[PDB]
Point group: C5
């Protein structure tokens, strides 16, 4: 017998199957088991606070009205064009901003019915899910991206969503990200919603992303430290070398400003302060104070042996004072961003 | 009895229900109560003057032709595919530039009919609403974003829109914005339209957004002030140090110009003047005048004891005159932008 | 009687109404009166030469086959889903690159039929209309944007388009533009097309846009003038101060180049010369000549009393010669761009 | 008689017209004459190698099965909704990456049938056609854009495409391009394809685009030449002026680097060398050699009358040697890019 | 006889053809032979890790139920509108993020049936395929782009995909890429998938892309080397020339920083270190050490004949030491990136 003809007998008007009535309409709720396979992951943007995924979604549930025993085959396949003749759960993604299905060649959907009445429903789709980001410690920050699966109009006494026991969420190997690193550990939660109407089923997954630091370390932190160090060689130059010392100080200030201005074009645009901003401001303050040191030294010396000793004392003190304060600032800055980060 | 079969009897040709005829076609107008739940908020742009939202819209009204008493159930659910068989209000958003519905998995729409005839209609959609912006005080500015709900072809004697009493507008917790802060207070208005045809119902909501200032303060205002201060140390250098003083002045001017040029790439593009532009121009004028001070001083001295006293008097006067004028400008600038802002 | 049932009798097969036959098929042409209400205006781009509008379009014409007298009501409303059962003009926008209708909630369309047979047809749509731009005087330029309404396949002996007498075009209050100013005066034209087939009806509107100048004046013209002025203080420095004068000249040249390079990132990208480009080049030429003046002066002096007088004469002449030529250039530049602009 | 009723008799089941059978199914092939009218032209990009057009396409062919003599009218118009009931050629654009039709108001399509059986089919559509570009001589380059019209599944013994004799291709007046100039001369070709199946008809048009040079000349070539000239004034300064000469040389190098860095942001991004790159590198090499000249001169002089003569000889030789080599390079560079360009 | 009427007899209800039943439903699997012709290739982006293609896909398989002998014609063509009445393989692209078909003029699809029952199915479509990239050696890197063809719901005992023997993959001549070079060699693989359900057929192709180096060599590597060389001329200047030597060193540092900042805007944005970053950092370290050399030399000399000899010894050693270390670094850097690259 034709499988299509058998499916017609199973789900036609003579059978009386109603696609708008859920299975077990009188008694216990329907239990749906879900799996997610992630094919691609990326397009993480802070201007819109969202990311893009391409996933495989599989749902399994039992429909006692679809049980059959006459047909020898143990499974039956349904045409994607007739999927509206069967009951399906009204799943939707809560934090979703855009989605679509895939139609290249044939429609990317599959539905299978077994002898006992179990239904397997696997579909492929692309999502744009929103995720808030903090960026308060931007060079050293960890972000969490979630994905919520919810029912639209069924309460907990009608529909229940559960994760699989073996492997709910899997990620294809070889995926890379230009800016982040996706950790292998994932969390499965129960974010049940409580409204006036009642409780609504909802399951959640969490992804942890860590940002790499090599480019920032080699392109922003090291040159700033080198410029700050170069600003210290003024204290080792003779005090009667004003056209050299003043020029060196002002050119170090200019170099610091050009470095900071160049670094701004390749950073996220936010209105609040970040750790790299704090570092940049402190380096600018250091190279700014280095010039006032020599300004104070030149005035005291010109004032008319005691005067020329006091001017030299300031240089000898500064030679050891400036690196010590810089080191104290460095250790304070690094411990609170590499330890106080959980 | 099947709920779908009962709905067919209620809204079929035998019943004679007409979807193109509003409820109470002869007498009083229809009253519609509206709720809005905001899921996401962002994508605020000044180039296009618009923002993006993802909302839940709920409408409630009474239809006496849909009252039923035979069916034991107190509520009935309608299939989203047959929503064209029932009368719905012709609501639309007046300041909308783009909208779409959501179809991932099942269509994201719901319609419920109660025994007395009340109808609940909840749908999910994404909007692109336009909002004019001023940006005349750009670092310290407050913007207001509105959302207008209007009827397309029904006058006030046929259709009336009202807000809920309990909670018209709600916002999901945890929403963040890269540039603005959304205040918790919202306004509900009655922006009724008066045309030649007649009065048309319209309700409005207002959102207040405040821009943060930490990044601008730490990256634009402070370095400019530091450069202006550095330009003042020329007055404390010996007047016979022309290769030092001239070089310091011209390098401070160059540093100011590089800072201003670097800051321009990360600002909104408008054709009118802003407060940050005023600040930048004043700082440039100060560092420009500092060099002319020394130009005047070098000429008077070379002219051939009275001459060398007059040159020193200018330096001694400038040492106190320049910071005083800068302080006066600072307090004048800050009070009119932090007080005269309502 | 049901209005829908009456409309069925009026426009059914028993009536014999044909939607593919224009009114007055044998005799005089159909006269259509048009109104346009503009809701939003913006997204003006020079890379693609186009702008975006959101408008309300209303058309009115008389159909003698739709006259009715039995029904007491003075007006009848047609369902948007059945709009294909009535004859409508084949209007289209000639300079249009993209358009779409609005479907949020219900379709944004309306059709009304009166007793005498008059038809009112109001619809809402979004356009992307193309407009060529010159940008030859870019800081001080006026652009004109047009909007053409044309018939696709009807000649002047079948279809005629006319503007309203009272108010063809209206603009909603409160619209702002980030770069331009929209003048309140509009033009109504008759841009009838003449082809081999015959004359085709076409009406036109014109919008005048003026660009603001405050940002450009405060950020490009003033700093360049300040740098040019700073380049003149070399003539007031002692001629035996080569490490000061040469450094000041070359640093002014460098500052001019940095200002010009920074200003380029925020300007329209075209391949022809603009007024701001002319100004930038002239300022660079001035600061370039200022250094050659001192180069000539240093050589004549070293050559071995008559020689040291000739060198001083050049400085004394230049002190008055350079600002005079700059002033002459300034007045010549400004009069031809603020007067010869119509 | 109704024209629609006559068309029904002409192309109904009683007539037996088959839309899947080409005219003259047994004998000679069908000859189709094509016209193209271009409404807009632009959006030329090198990152994607494509351009955008909005055109009117007209096709004419003879169908002997559609000849009529009973109806007095000499022409008949077909409804755009019933265009699938008639045979049309399967034309498509070979180098097309994206296309769509226009539906604002009514569908922008037209089909007319004459008494002898001739068919006129005019439609409006938007294309995104791909064009490879070289950019090897980027400031002075000419690009050619093509447009291929091909049949999908008909060989030369079934379908033949021909251009019109009078005016195949026309361009609307007033079109402007921000970067290129469209020449008035166009080419018509026969790019017939030869495959295993057989010969397939294909016609081609070519457009020639020339890039303007005013902006590049006034903003890149002239300032570089001015900086190179400024680097030559070191040879006219006294050899015992090291803090002036060294500073002038290094500042000219820095100015050259800043100019080159600023110019890079507004150029096409390719991985191969361009003429502007060659010019930039040569200018940098010149300003680099100018400093080594003075480095060599200072060492020879300090070495301890014969020594001080040799140092002066180098300066006197360089004063004439450097501009001569620069002039030779200039004429060599310009002749091979303005003559060897065909 | 009409070919459409013959096709109706062949694939109608009287024939009993079922489009949901694969050929040879009881026995051996179906063998499908595939060809791919690439029309365009480009839009390679590292922010989204994907590329765009426009291809022709051809599939051939044998259907014994479609064999015919009555009709004299050796081939029959099927209408694209009725393609759902025939069985087609459920091919899909595994690494695909977006796809669409082409409808300009007629639909771009073709299906032919021969006498023995063979089916030829050629269609045109556009893809957006994802490809991970490394960019760890960014100036000198080779990337591989794949394209996977897979079945959605058929195991290896039902459906098998094979490449053609003669020419599976062909590329149109004249294709260019702004950044890469496409090698002429391609690979054909068998990437069969093993799941819990069973084995699924899958074929793969690989494309090798090489990045050109001319622009990077002429714009980044050469100027950095020139600046490093210019930093070495300090060792040939007299040690008592502090205002010259210090200024030259600090200006070389500033020039290096400006070059590095300018080069950053035109590079891919990643968070890990690249070869160009390593080169930039080493050049900055060299120009940084050159200034400390003179700082050490000036202090030793001022300390108060033995002292003035030790200071000169450092300069004489550095004159040969610095270029030697630079050369060693250069050869080490180039051999490990031009040899250790496979
Ligand atoms: C769906 O799962 C729930 C949870 O296991 C089932 O509800 C339980 O059913 C068992 C019967 O074996 C009862 O003993 C439990 O008390 C039920 N749980 C609760 C909280 O009441 C439910 O039966 C399942 N649905 C179906 C159709 O089997
Ligand atoms: C919709 O609301 C309006 C406003 O309350 C109702 O109009 C009023 O109806 C009451 C009857 O209880 C009258 O006493 C008032 O005079 C009415 N207001 C006005 C301004 O005339 C209207 O009845 C409501 N619609 C329905 C169907 O109940
Ligand atoms: C549409 O408008 C035109 C222009 O007014 C009408 O044509 C005129 O009709 C009057 C009749 O009252 C004649 O006296 C004029 O000579 C006509 N103008 C021309 C140029 O011939 C036309 O009648 C209108 N259409 C309809 C249906 O009334
Ligand atoms: C389409 O055009 C071709 C080319 O002119 C026609 O083929 C020619 O027909 C004439 C008959 O007048 C013959 O004398 C020529 O020998 C034909 N050319 C070739 C190359 O064989 C063809 O007849 C035209 N199609 C129709 C339907 O008229
Ligand atoms: C599809 O191709 C496969 C592989 O060649 C065919 O399977 C083989 O069929 C031959 C019969 O000529 C057997 O001798 C081989 O043992 C088969 N291979 C295996 C691995 O069992 C298959 O018959 C082809 N399908 C059709 C419909 O002809
Ligand atoms: C020493 C000064 C110089 C700059 C200062 C920082 C500037 C701005 C901020 C951001 C603010 O939100 C918390 C304090 C903090 C982090 C300051 C801490 C103290 C600080 C590091
Ligand atoms: C002291 C000068 C220097 C620059 C000047 C400003 C420059 C431009 C503008 C914008 C104009 O719209 C109002 C006046 C205002 C704000 C000026 C006020 C006075 C001012 C602050
Ligand atoms: C004095 C020189 C220096 C630069 C010159 C301009 C440079 C380029 C152009 C553009 C050209 O199209 C017309 C002449 C014009 C406007 C020149 C006019 C004369 C000019 C202003
Ligand atoms: C004199 C030197 C300095 C730079 C050199 C050019 C640098 C790079 C290229 C690109 C190459 O593809 C052909 C040679 C060419 C064009 C060189 C020609 C000779 C040249 C102009
Ligand atoms: C000599 C120093 C200066 C900078 C150094 C490099 C800086 C950073 C990296 C990236 C890291 O992942 C491997 C080592 C490597 C490549 C270092 C190798 C040694 C190095 C070249």
């Amino acid at each position: 017998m034709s499988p299509s003809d058998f499916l017609d007998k199973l789900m036609g008007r003579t059978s009386g199957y109603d696609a708008r009535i859920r299975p077990n309409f009188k008694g216990p709720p329907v239990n749906v088991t879900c799996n997610i396979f992630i094919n691609s992951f990326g397009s993480i943007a802070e201007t819109t606070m969202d990311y893009r995924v391409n996933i495989f979604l599989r749902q399994k549930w039992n429909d006692p009205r679809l049980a059959y025993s006459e047909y020898p085959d143990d499974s039956l396949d349904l045409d994607p064009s007739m999927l509206d003749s069967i009951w399906k759960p009204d799943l939707f993604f809560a934090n979703e901003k855009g989605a679509n299905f895939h139609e290249v060649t044939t429609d990317n959907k599959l539905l299978r019915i077994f002898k006992n009445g179990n239904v397997l429903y696997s579909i492929r789709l692309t999502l744009t899910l929103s995720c808030p980001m903090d960026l308060k410690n931007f060079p050293m920050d960890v972000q969490t991206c979630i994905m919520q699966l919810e029912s639209f109009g069924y309460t907990m006494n009608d529909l229940i969503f559960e994760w699989q026991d073996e492997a709910p969420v899997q990620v294809a190997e070889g995926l890379t990200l230009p800016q982040f690193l996706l950790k292998e550990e994932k969390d499965l939660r129960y974010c049940t919603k409580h409204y006036n109407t009642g409780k609504f089923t909802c399951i959640e997954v969490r992804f942890h992303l860590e940002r790499q630091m090599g480019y920032y370390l080699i392109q922003m932190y090291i040159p700033s430290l080198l410029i700050v160090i170069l600003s210290w060689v003024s204290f080792w130059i003779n005090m009667d070398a004003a056209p050299a010392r003043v020029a060196l100080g002002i050119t170090t200030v200019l170099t610091m400003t050009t470095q900071s201005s160049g670094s701004r074009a390749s950073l996220p645009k936010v209105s609040y302060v970040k750790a790299i901003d704090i570092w940049m401001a402190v380096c600018l303050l250091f190279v700014f104070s280095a010039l006032l040191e020599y300004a104070a030294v030149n005035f005291v010396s010109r004032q008319h042996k005691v005067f020329i000793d006091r001017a030299k004392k300031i240089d000898t003190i500064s030679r050891a004072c400036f690196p010590l304060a810089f080191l104290i600032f460095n250790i304070f800055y690094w411990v609170i961003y590499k330890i106080l980060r959980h």
